[PDB]
Amino acid sequence: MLEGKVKWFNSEKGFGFIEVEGQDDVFVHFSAIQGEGFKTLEEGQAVSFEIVEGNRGPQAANVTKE
Ligand SMILES: [Mg+2]
Ligand code: NA
């Protein structure tokens, strides 16, 4: 599990990017967010996550707010 922070997140549509010091930003969709409640993220929030890649390229998976 990787660690980073939310660079920005469009809460209306439910996507944004996670920034990771010294690595490429990682796209995050709301469907990757763990936990209860409305799935959303705020700029600057600390997260743990994994990167999942298929034919569409890499995105965040298993995103937990820390
Ligand atoms: Mg950067
Ligand atoms: Na939820």
Q: In this structure, what CATH number is given to the domain that contains residue 14?
A: 2.40.50.140
The angstrom resolution of this structure is 1.4
Residue 11 Cα to ligand 1 middle (Å):
20
Q: How far is the CA of 30 from the centre of ligand 2 (A)?
A: 9
- Whole-angstrom Cα distance, residue 16 to residue 7? 7
Total number of domains constituting the chain? 1
CA of residue 28 to ligand 2 center, whole Å? 15
3-state DSSP assignment of residue 52: strand
Ligand 1 centre to CA of 23 (Å) is 8
**Residue showing tokens 């993220």:** 41
Please, how many CA atoms are within 13 Å of residue 61, restricted to the half-sphere of its CB?
8
Domain that holds residue 45: 1-66
Q: How many C-beta atoms surround the C-beta of residue 49 within 10 A?
A: 23
**Nearest ligand, measured from the Cα of 36:** 2
> Residue 18 CA: which ligand is closest?
1
Dihedral-angle region of residue 35 (phi above 0 means left; psi in -120 to 50 means alpha; beta otherwise): left
H or E stretch covering 20: strand 15-20
Longest dimension (CA), the chain: 32
